[PDB]
DNA sequence: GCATCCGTGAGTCGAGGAGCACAATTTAACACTTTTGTCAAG
DNA sequence: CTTGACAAAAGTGTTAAATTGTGCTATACTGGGAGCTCACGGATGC
């Protein structure tokens, strides 16, 4: 007891008796009359219909509270003909709560058929509950159709969307998830028909126009779930995928060393240059501020025009070529 | 700015948000197409930082010039990419969630403060029962509701929403009640249904409306899709609607004026409510709550008379108040967090202090446990409500990476899945709350949100573990990451993988010196690569380092000068050779590498025993110390030639071994001939004449005139050893022939081999006189004699000459064993002639036992015992016959010589080869009646081989299943004594222990001298506390007992001059956080006073645990590890002995009914009701003392402690642990056991708080309370009366001051939970805490005693002094 | 592993051996300079190839991982100094 | 129980096919197995 | 007494891994300037 | 070192085409389903 969350939830929803068809119509009528009453209230009292439905909902549920009482007392200040519409609004909200509560068995029966698709059983039910709430808002009892007929569309819609949105660590858009599901179904039908695993050409041909072997391969590559870093290898519980994946982001001690070796050798080579000529290359190549500068931007720092700096920058570049050729102390770092 | 202490504490929701660089609002990780991390997700660059250094997401800023800047286009700060390892996020929970650590860690920390049990806390937290936070005048079953009361869902619904019930009527029948009529419990509503509650019964759905027109009982049928719009008994005018409908065609109206009556309800709703009709518009509406006196509907004319939710029925024109209370009851962490917010810890402490005076012990214990948690929160400054999470921290993404791999597919950690679920449920709950979802939907989501947090923090702690869909593997949570053998502590902090490390197979190098190893060139090139690249750059091999490295990448590109440079690199440097398991400290030794051709490591033969390394496929690890400190430590402290003695016992550990002993024993043993053997003569010339005639052999013992000599002693008299060995070379005499030699002016009568051995030692030590005193010439050199020579050479000469002597012994032992001619043949396993006679004697006696049993003179169990005793006796007789035959007839037999010299084998194994295999045991432990009468030379039968396989399997299983127990024991011992270091020269204590020289012998009932190994293991290398006068020799106070002093003390005990020796021991040491130099004694590996700063605690644990693990891998199965672990854990034995709590005279009252023992004193008389099967070791007429055993068995350490005292239990624990290791022949000094026992007796329990803030029964360290007592005494206050306490190594290690060391050991969840609440600050005193932080350990070269030493030449010192004192 | 060109595991018992020997600096190098001190191991390699002695090591990265994982458990782990003042072991890279 | 075939030499593969394992799905555990499960029984004569 | 949690040696070589319609949004392709480097002499 | 041409790469806009996110669908359907030589002593809890 209380250690199985599914069992505890089922017991909780089992405490609300199922609605007879008469009770369903009465509750459905009250919600529609209540929603219309909120519209009539807003039109007359002038505030936002969304604002009023929250105030009415707050009073029913009970327990910004500063303004809720201000609006609630304002609504009660209306005359009798207008306080009546408040009464239907309150009963409509109370009936909406009761109508949602009594259909919590419907979501469970629908949600039990969607297990094993990346979401847990309780996650499916809660997503089904969101669809059930949407069903009550849009349900119309004037058409004389029972609630389970129309709710089932919204309950399955919410479960499908949640799976397409929450069943993968790397989220894939709904349209592509539908494509991936359609691709897998098409492959399986060919696989059971041809008695072997179909090739990409065969899968693409069965899919239809606009599909080739390249697109099928890309879609399958996209549909590759990431693998856990903690999955063990072998019977011994001491090795995981994380123990065999090197880190290629941080520089290795060798890479950091040769970068320092290059930096100290380049500044030593630049010493042979003139005071200004070395400054131009270090600033044109971004060795001082970190970022490469332009001839115009370098020009403002020395007050020199664009064309002249290119000449001294090239002349300084040529002198380093002369020095490197006579020493060969810089070729190896390339 | 040096980390000196680490503090752990609770994190407030405010502090968690201060850590976070941004809230993670979406579960998205990365985009599926571009692979760039998604905004507001788990990998958002705006929160955790840029993927690459100095570059925003939009790619507008890409250099370090804009450092410390946040781009306006994307919001990503331009900084280093490594900040993604350090920048955290947070999840703003829609509703608070409790931290599972402070809930499910027994005893619950939240439950302790709130006085809620584990059951009650779980029910509230996981939304099973409500808890009252404001009763609001609620009455439940006639009893007012109080705060902190637990309500079930049914009870809360009745109180909050009232009592109501619907009864579905059968179709067609009409109820006998009317709409709006009160009923009572049990009253019939319809003729088929009855009520269960008293209240207003109202019509739900009238299936038929019967209007009475005034002109007329016209009947209307009401379908489910139609509703009645008028009351019952309502006057409806012609035209007014009666029943509404969706389609107006079927809508029913009123033809004329009439009264509407409702009939045939679908069901009757009986609600316990009050009805109030209203004349004008109602001042309240549906869903509001009213109290007695509130103006209900008619502008003050109609007023409420009872609490309840008000619902107005527009059609009935009445106002219904459903009797209910606005009770404030909530579930989950919301109510729990509010309860912890309202707690006044100061007020709670005062109440707990008052309750702490209850004479009941149980209530004081419960109050103390609660008060410890309350005091922890007050002193730490944490707040109790911080244990409920309002914002959940998010780990930095680089610690939970989603990395692409060598291929193209992605790999992610399990924390991303746990974070995603928490975000998915948190966002869904926010949506559900915004849609005004019903309570059941909200309650289910809040419960799921709580479980999502619990799974993230500690997966599987509560409920079923969370598994990744598509697999059954539990997800790895934060608790799993930091706890266990594979956790962060043990896998990445206490041990790490290291660079500059290699591994290869080891082979024997006999030509190596003791300090040298054979390192392959290819390993050395890679291990010393950075040093090599510099050397190639120094020479002309390569222009620079980078060109040098490219040269070494390709094997065919390496020239011959690289190897020459590699020789220059390793000159002087040493490497560390390592063999797993590193049971003791000499499992890692420093060697000077010698580059060799090949791929295997050459290991010196003498270091094999220390490493436990043979050459049947062993492998070793190579490590390269880098800096000058690391090289200096390895060359000075860790060098193989410097560690010659065993730290556990002080005996030599690098000593001659199997092949070396055999070669030295073979040449030093003499020949014993039997040809002459007894003839007597008159002159030596006659004896010599007989030898030339063949009547008497060269070594036959004869008598010349009166003296017993041999012909060799007379015929061959050599002037000097050079002539004696010259005769050996020419073949006149052998090394084993006893002759007469003149050596050092003495006309010795020994063999040339013994004289040769004397020169071997003399030339090795380069001093003839000392080497003469070190050797034992008149005996063959076995393992024991060679071990004594190494120890004596170490004392007289030092490490350098002993290592030289060790190498000389190794060279000559190997040389002589090769040419001597040791070989094993099938005939070398000589079958004694006595075996056949013994077996026939056994068979005749076995038949006699069988004949006696057939006559019924003895039972089955007795006959089986008699059979075993006969076969055990016969087996022992054959063992003697096997070795007697060797000693008399084949003194040079390879099996005999190997066994006698100690090179290989024991008499038990020689018997199986030469005598008989013996008795074997069934898998149940019973022995087979028939023994294995055939040896290995004769060959077992198929049945005997199968019978013998039961014990081989049983022994092999123990070799595998007892290693974990010993290795676990060693880890316990290390973690409890890791902080013990020699920290000062002398603590100034006047206490000591009196090591007994005589032990009570129970079978004789008298004092007998203990064994020499017993006294040496308890007195060697110990400082005398008091002056001792023995045999005219004065051993003054403070004198370290050497091995000669121990022998002198033993000799004095034999003369009845001393019964016990007072020595300074760690047990009586007063040094805080360790021991002192004068209380520890010698460093047994150097036979000199222990150096200040040595980690003797680690040495003690390794010294104790090594024989336990070493022997089980080769006894310890029954009374080894089981008894040692039981003793070290201070566990109560199952068959515990019975001790007398008081001293007095015993009075046995044995009777047929029961056995009772009475201990009688002057006024006291204690009664001990022993079981019938009790082996009493005391009889009537004896004076027993307190704690003295009365029954054979194992003494409970805790009972002995409270009956005799701390000194007695310390003596008992050290002695009993020693008794085990002595049984298997292990020599281990008492210091190491006393160090561990000192840690066990480290804590005390408060009995009288006195003038202090401590609580009665509180457990704290003895050093702290003694310091507290003297402080209280200094300021004139009542001292704290405490009680000595004993706890095992596991409990003592877990209750240490440092949480870092305790968390890394065990109970990481429990240790961290208690530390965070208490706000414990770790001062980083021991060794593990410094290892975790990577600091310099406060032992060895890292100790404050030696770390600040300064070295300077005189010229600079004179210059500094002259240039400063000149002013 | 040899296949991954990996290092040798210097486990707990090997650490105990250095502690028993008193090789405080040899132990510290293996814990920091040769395993996970990123700044230390880069500077140590650079120092060696320049013919210099390796610098003094720093805090290991595994301890930084431990602190951040402890912080993910809502535990305020703070490294202090002699005067109980907080010490930043993250070089200012995690201070908002 | 589906193990990588040990085929160093023909005897290796022959042994691997005749090995009997108490572990695997539905069997004992390497660490939770006592001395009784691992000891040679009197009925292994001629069978194991 | 029992219910539950916690513990059970160290290295190593391989082996391993439902549909469509709609609005909303971002990603590409096309032009037209911009700035930005290259000769051109003087 | 300047001035003036010259490509032109880089930068700013435009509509378009994928690409992604979102709401809807009306017979009636109203409490899951998976797993089963439990490993065994020891310590702290009601
Ligand atoms: C006493 C004698 C010299 C006397 C003199 O100089 N006059 C010295 C000089 C060279 C020494 C030998 C070599 O070291 C090799 C070898 C080393 C082993 O460790 C022990 C055995 C060996 C044979 C040694 C024995 C002895 O020690 C010798 C003969
Ligand atoms: N599961 C194991 C098996 C072996 N070892 C180590 O490897 C050695 C293997 O020893 P073994 O070959 O079984 O016997 P020896 O002691 O070598 O036998 P002998 O004395 O006859 O040479 C053990 O002692 C131990 O050092 C281990 O640590 N863990
Ligand atoms: Mg295996
Ligand atoms: Mg061996
Ligand atoms: Mg071996
Ligand atoms: Mg002679
Ligand atoms: Zn940017
Ligand atoms: Zn002391």
From TrEMBL, chain A:
<feature type="binding site">
    <location>
        <position position="211"/>
    </location>
    <ligand>
        <name>Mg(2+) 5</name>
    </ligand>
</feature>
<comment type="function">
    <text>Sigma factors are initiation factors that promote the attachment of RNA polymerase to specific initiation sites and are then released. This sigma factor is the primary sigma factor during exponential growth.</text>
</comment>
<feature type="binding site">
    <location>
        <position position="211"/>
    </location>
    <ligand>
        <name>Mg(2+) 4</name>
    </ligand>
</feature>
<comment type="subunit">
    <text>Interacts transiently with the RNA polymerase catalytic core.</text>
</comment>
<dbReference type="GO" id="GO:0016987">
    <property type="term" value="F:sigma factor activity"/>
</dbReference>
<feature type="binding site">
    <location>
        <position position="329"/>
    </location>
    <ligand>
        <name>Mg(2+) 11</name>
    </ligand>
</feature>
<feature type="DNA-binding region" description="H-T-H motif">
    <location>
        <begin position="295"/>
        <end position="314"/>
    </location>
</feature>
<dbReference type="GO" id="GO:0046872">
    <property type="term" value="F:metal ion binding"/>
</dbReference>
<dbReference type="GO" id="GO:0005737">
    <property type="term" value="C:cytoplasm"/>
</dbReference>
<feature type="binding site">
    <location>
        <position position="204"/>
    </location>
    <ligand>
        <name>Mg(2+) 4</name>
    </ligand>
</feature>
<keyword id="KW-0731">Sigma factor</keyword>
<feature type="binding site">
    <location>
        <position position="204"/>
    </location>
    <ligand>
        <name>Mg(2+) 3</name>
    </ligand>
</feature>
<keyword id="KW-0963">Cytoplasm</keyword>
<feature type="binding site">
    <location>
        <position position="211"/>
    </location>
    <ligand>
        <name>Mg(2+) 7</name>
    </ligand>
</feature>
<feature type="binding site">
    <location>
        <position position="332"/>
    </location>
    <ligand>
        <name>Mg(2+) 11</name>
    </ligand>
</feature>
<dbReference type="GO" id="GO:0006352">
    <property type="term" value="P:DNA-templated transcription initiation"/>
</dbReference>
<comment type="similarity">
    <text>Belongs to the sigma-70 factor family. RpoD/SigA subfamily.</text>
</comment>
<feature type="binding site">
    <location>
        <position position="238"/>
    </location>
    <ligand>
        <name>Mg(2+) 10</name>
    </ligand>
</feature>
<keyword id="KW-0805">Transcription regulation</keyword>
<feature type="short sequence motif" description="Interaction with polymerase core subunit RpoC">
    <location>
        <begin position="123"/>
        <end position="126"/>
    </location>
</feature>
<feature type="binding site">
    <location>
        <position position="77"/>
    </location>
    <ligand>
        <name>Mg(2+) 2</name>
    </ligand>
</feature>
<feature type="binding site">
    <location>
        <position position="208"/>
    </location>
    <ligand>
        <name>Mg(2+) 7</name>
    </ligand>
</feature>
<feature type="binding site">
    <location>
        <position position="208"/>
    </location>
    <ligand>
        <name>Mg(2+) 6</name>
    </ligand>
</feature>
<feature type="binding site">
    <location>
        <position position="204"/>
    </location>
    <ligand>
        <name>Mg(2+) 5</name>
    </ligand>
</feature>
<keyword id="KW-0804">Transcription</keyword>
<feature type="region of interest" description="Sigma-70 factor domain-2">
    <location>
        <begin position="99"/>
        <end position="169"/>
    </location>
</feature>
<feature type="domain" description="RNA polymerase sigma-70">
    <location>
        <begin position="294"/>
        <end position="320"/>
    </location>
</feature>
<protein>
    <recommendedName>
        <fullName>RNA polymerase sigma factor SigA</fullName>
    </recommendedName>
</protein>
<keyword id="KW-0479">Metal-binding</keyword>
<keyword id="KW-0238">DNA-binding</keyword>
<dbReference type="GO" id="GO:0003677">
    <property type="term" value="F:DNA binding"/>
</dbReference>
<feature type="binding site">
    <location>
        <position position="208"/>
    </location>
    <ligand>
        <name>Mg(2+) 3</name>
    </ligand>
</feature>
<feature type="binding site">
    <location>
        <position position="208"/>
    </location>
    <ligand>
        <name>Mg(2+) 4</name>
    </ligand>
</feature>
<feature type="binding site">
    <location>
        <position position="211"/>
    </location>
    <ligand>
        <name>Mg(2+) 8</name>
    </ligand>
</feature>
<feature type="binding site">
    <location>
        <position position="235"/>
    </location>
    <ligand>
        <name>Mg(2+) 9</name>
    </ligand>
</feature>
């Amino acid at each position: 007891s209380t250690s199985d969350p599914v069992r505890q939830y089922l017991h909780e929803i089992g405490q609300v008796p199922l609605l007879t068809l008469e009770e369903e119509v009465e509750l459905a009528r009250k919600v529609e009359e209540g929603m219309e009453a909120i519209k009539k209230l807003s039109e007359i009292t002038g505030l936002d219909p969304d604002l009023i439905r929250e105030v009415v909902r707050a009073k029913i549920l009970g327990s910004d509270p500063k303004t809720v009482e201000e609006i609630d007392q304002k609504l009660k200040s209306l005359p009798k003909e207008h306080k009546r519409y408040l009464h239907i609004a309150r009963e409509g909200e109370a009936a909406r709560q009761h109508l949602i509560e009594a259909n919590l068995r419907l979501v469970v029966s629908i949600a039990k058929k969607y297990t094993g698709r990346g979401l847990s059983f309780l996650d499916l039910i809660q997503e089904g509950n969101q669809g059930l709430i949407r069903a009550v808002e849009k349900f119309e009892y004037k058409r004389r159709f029972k609630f389970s007929t129309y709710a089932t569309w919204w309950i399955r819609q919410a479960i499908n969307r949640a799976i397409a949105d929450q069943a993968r660590t790397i989220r894939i858009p709904v349209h592509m998830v539908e494509t991936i599901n359609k691709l897998s179904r098409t492959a399986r039908q060919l696989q059971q028909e041809l008695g072997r695993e179909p090739t990409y050409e065969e899968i693409a041909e069965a899919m239809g126009p606009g599909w080739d072997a390249k697109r099928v391969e890309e879609t399958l590559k996209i549909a590759q779930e990431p693998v856990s870093l903690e999955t063990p290898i072998g019977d011994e519980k001491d090795s995981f995928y994380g123990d065999f994946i090197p880190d290629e982001h941080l520089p290795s001690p060798v890479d950091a060393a040769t970068q320092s070796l290059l930096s100290e050798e380049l500044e030593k080579a630049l010493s042979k240059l003139s005071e200004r000529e070395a400054m131009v290359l270090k600033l044109r190549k971004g060795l001082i501020d970190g970022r490469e500068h332009t001839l115009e931007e370098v020009g403002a720092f020395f007050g020199v025009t664009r064309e002249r700096i290119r000449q001294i920058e090239n002349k300084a570049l040529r002198k380093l070529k002369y020095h490197e050729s006579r020493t060969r102390k810089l070729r190896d770092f390339l | 700015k040096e980390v000196r202490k680490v503090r752990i504490a609770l994190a407030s929701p405010e502090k968690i948000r201060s850590w976070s660089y941004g809230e993670v609002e979406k579960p998205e990780t990365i985009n599926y197409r571009t692979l760039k991390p998604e905004r507001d997700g788990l990998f958002d660059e705006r929160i955790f930082g840029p993927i690459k250094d100095y570059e925003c997401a939009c790619g507008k800023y890409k250099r370090q010039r804009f450092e410390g800047k946040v781009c306006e286009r994307c919001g990503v700060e331009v900084t280093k990419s490594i900040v993604r390892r350090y920048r955290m996020g947070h999840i703003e929970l829609a509703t608070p969630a409790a931290h599972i650590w402070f809930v499910k860690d027994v005893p619950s920390k939240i439950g302790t403060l709130l006085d809620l049990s584990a059951t009650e806390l779980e029910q509230v937290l996981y939304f099973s029962k409500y808890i009252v936070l404001d009763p609001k005048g609620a009455i439940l079953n006639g009893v007012p509701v109080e705060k902190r009361q637990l309500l079930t869902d049914e009870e809360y619904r009745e109180l909050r929403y009232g009592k109501q019930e619907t009864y579905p009527l059968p179709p067609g029948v009409d109820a006998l009640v009317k709409d709006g009529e009160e009923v009572v419990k049990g009253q019939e509503l319809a003729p088929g249904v009855v009520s269960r509650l008293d209240g207003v019964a109202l019509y739900r759905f009238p299936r038929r409306v019967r209007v009475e027109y005034v002109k007329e009982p016209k009947d209307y049928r009401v379908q489910p899709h139609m509703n009645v719009v008028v009351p019952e008994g309502a006057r409806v005018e012609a035209g007014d609607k009666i029943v509404a409908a969706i389609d107006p065609e079927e809508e029913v109206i009123a033809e004329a004026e009439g009264v509407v009556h409702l009939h045939e309800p679908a069901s009757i709703l009986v609600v316990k409510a009050r009805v109030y009709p209203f004349e004008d518009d109602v001042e309240v509406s549906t869903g509001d709550r009213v109290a007695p006196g509130d103006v209900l509907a008619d502008g003050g004319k109609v007023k409420s008379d009872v609490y309840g939710r008000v619902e107005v029925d527009l059609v009935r024109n009445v106002v219904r108040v459903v009797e209910s209370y606005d009770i404030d009851a909530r579930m989950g962490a919301e109510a729990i967090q509010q309860l912890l917010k309202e707690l006044d810890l100061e007020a709670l402490e005062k109440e707990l202090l008052e309750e702490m005076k209850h004479p009941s012990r149980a209530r004081r214990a419960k109050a103390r446990k609660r008060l410890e948690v309350v005091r922890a929160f007050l002193d730490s400054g944490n707040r109790p409500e911080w244990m409920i999470l309002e914002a959940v921290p998010v780990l930095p993404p680089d610690l939970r990476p989603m990395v692409q791999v060598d291929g193209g597919r992605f790999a992610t950690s399990d924390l991303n899945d746990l974070y995603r679920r928490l975000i998915n449920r948190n966002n869904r709950l926010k949506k559900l709350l915004a849609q005004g979802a019903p309570e059941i939907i909200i309650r289910n989501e809040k419960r799921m949100l709580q479980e999502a947090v619990d799974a993230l923090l500690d997966n599987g702690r509560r409920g079923a573990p969370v598994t990744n869909p598509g697999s059954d593997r539990p997800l790895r949570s934060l608790t799993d990451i930091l706890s266990g053998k594979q956790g962060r502590f043990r896998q990445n902090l206490l041990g790490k993988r290291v660079d500059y490390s290699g591994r290869s197979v080891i082979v024997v190098g006999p030509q190596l010196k003791l300090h040298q190893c054979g390192l392959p060139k290819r390993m050395a090139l890679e291990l010393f690569k950075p040093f090599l690249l510099k050397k190639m750059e120094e020479k002309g091999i390569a222009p620079n380092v980078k060109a040098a490295r490219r040269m070494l990448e390709r094997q065919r590109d390496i020239k011959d000068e690289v190897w020459d440079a590699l020789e220059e690199v390793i000159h002087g440097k040493v490497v560390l050779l390592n063999r797993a398991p590193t049971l003791h400290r000499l499992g890692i030794q420093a060697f000077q590498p010698v580059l060799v051709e090949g791929q295997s490591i050459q290991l010196h033969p003498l270091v094999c025993e220390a490493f436990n390394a043979d050459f049947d496929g062993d492998q070793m690890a190579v490590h390269v110390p880098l800096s000058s400190f690391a090289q200096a430590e390895a060359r000075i402290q860790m060098l193989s030639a410097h560690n010659l003695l065993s730290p556990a016992s002080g005996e030599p550990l690098a000593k001659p071994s199997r092949d070396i002993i055999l070669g030295l024993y073979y040449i030093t043993q003499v020949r014993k001939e039997k040809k002459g053997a007894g003839l007597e003569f008159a002159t030596p010339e006659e004896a010599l004449a007989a030898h030339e005639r063949g009547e008497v052999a060269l070594n036959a013992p004869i008598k010349v005139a009166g003296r017993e000599t041999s012909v060799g002693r007379l015929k061959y008299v050599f002037a000097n050893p050079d002539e004696a060995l010259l005769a050996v070379a020419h073949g006149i005499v052998d090394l084993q022939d006893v002759v007469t030699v003149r050596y050092m002016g003495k006309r010795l009568e020994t063999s040339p081999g013994r004289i040769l051995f004397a020169r071997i030692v003399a030339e090795a030590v380069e001093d003839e006189k000392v080497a003469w005193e070190l050797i034992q010439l008149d005996v063959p050199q076995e393992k024991n004699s060679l071990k004594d020579l190494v120890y004596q050479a170490f004392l007289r000469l030092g490490m350098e000459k002993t290592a030289r002597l060790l190498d000389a012994l190794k060279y000559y032992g190997f040389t002589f064993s090769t040419t001597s001619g040791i070989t094993i043949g099938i005939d070398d396993a000589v079958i004694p002639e006595e075996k056949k006679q013994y077996l026939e004697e056994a068979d005749r006696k076995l038949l006699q036992i069988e004949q006696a049993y057939e006559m019924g003179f003895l039972t089955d169990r007795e006959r089986y015992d008699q059979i075993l005793q006969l076969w055990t006796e016969t087996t022992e007789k054959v063992t003697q016959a096997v070795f007697k035959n060797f000693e008399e007839n084949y003194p040079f037999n390879p099996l005999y010589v190997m066994a006698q010299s100690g090179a290989r084998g024991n008499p038990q194994q020689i018997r199986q080869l030469c005598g008989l295999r013996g008795l074997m045991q069934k898998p149940s432990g019973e022995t087979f009646e028939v023994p294995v009468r055939s040896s290995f030379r004769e060959g077992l039968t198929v049945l005997e081989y199968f019978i013998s396989s039961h014990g081989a399997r049983k022994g092999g299983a123990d070799t595998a299943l007892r290693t974990a127990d010993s290795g676990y024991l060693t880890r316990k011992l290390v973690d409890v004594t890791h902080e013990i270091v020699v920290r000062e020269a002398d603590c100034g204590t006047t206490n000591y222990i009196s090591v007994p020289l005589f032990q009570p012998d129970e079978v004789t009932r008298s004092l007998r001298l203990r064994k020499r190994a017993d006294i040496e293991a308890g007195l060697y290398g110990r400082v005398l506390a008091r002056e001792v006068e023995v045999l005219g020799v004065r051993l003054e106070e403070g004198r370290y007992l050497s091995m000669d002093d121990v022998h002198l003390l033993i000799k004095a005990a034999e003369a009845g001059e001393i019964q016990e020796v007072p020595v300074r021991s760690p047990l009586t040491c007063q040094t805080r956080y360790g021991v002192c130099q004068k209380c520890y004694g010698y460093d047994l590996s150097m036979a000199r006073p222990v150096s200040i700063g040595e980690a003797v605690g680690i040495v003690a644990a390794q010294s104790i645990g090594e024989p336990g693990t070493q022997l089980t891998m080769r006894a310890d199965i029954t009374q080894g590890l089981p008894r040692v672990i039981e003793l070290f854990e201070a566990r109560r034995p199952k068959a515990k002995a019975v001790i007398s709590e008081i001293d007095g005279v015993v009075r046995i009252e044995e009777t047929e009914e029961k056995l009772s023992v009475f201990v009688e004193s002057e006024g006291f008389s204690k009664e001990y009701k022993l079981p019938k099967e009790a082996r009493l070791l005391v009889k009537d007429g004896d004076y027993v003392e307190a704690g003295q055993p009365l029954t054979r068995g194992a003494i409970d350490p805790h009972q002995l402690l409270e009956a005799k005292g701390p000194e007695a239990v310390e003596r008992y624990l050290v002695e009993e642990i020693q008794k085990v290791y002595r049984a298997q022949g292990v020599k281990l000094h008492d210091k190491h056991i006393e160090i561990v026992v000192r840690q066990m007796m480290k804590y005390v329990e408060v009995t009288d708080p006195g003038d202090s803030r401590l609580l009665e029964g509180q457990v704290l360290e003895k050093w702290d309370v003694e310091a507290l007592n003297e402080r209280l005494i200094a300021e004139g206050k009542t001292p704290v009366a405490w009680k000595p306490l004993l706890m095992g190594v596991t409990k003592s290690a877990l209750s240490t001051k440092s949480w870092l060391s305790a968390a890394s050991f065990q109970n990481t969840t429990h240790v961290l939970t208690e530390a965070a609440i208490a706000g414990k600050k770790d001062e980083l005193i021991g060794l593990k805490e410094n290892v975790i932080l990577g600091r310099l350990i406060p032992a060895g070269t890292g100790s404050d005693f030696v770390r600040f030493t300064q070295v300077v030449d005189q010229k600079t010192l004179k210059a500094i002094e002259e240039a400063r004192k000149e002013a | 592993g040899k296949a991954q060109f990996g290092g040798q595991r210097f486990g707990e018992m090997e650490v105990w051996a250095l502690e028993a020997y008193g090789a405080a600096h040899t132990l510290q190098e293996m814990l920091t300079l040769k395993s996970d001190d990123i700044e230390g191991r880069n500077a140590a390699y650079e120092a060696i190839i320049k013919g210099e002695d390796v610098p003094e090591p720093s805090v290991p990265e595994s301890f930084r991982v431990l602190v951040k994982e402890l912080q993910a458990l809502a535990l305020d782990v703070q490294t202090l100094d002699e005067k109980d003042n907080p010490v930043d072991i993250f070089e200012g890279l995690a201070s908002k | 129980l589906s193990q990588f075939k040990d085929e160093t030499n023909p005897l290796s593969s022959l042994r691997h096919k005749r090995r009997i394992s108490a572990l695997g799905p539905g069997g004992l555990t390497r660490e939770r197995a006592g001395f009784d499960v691992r000891d040679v029984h009197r009925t292994h004569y001629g069978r194991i």
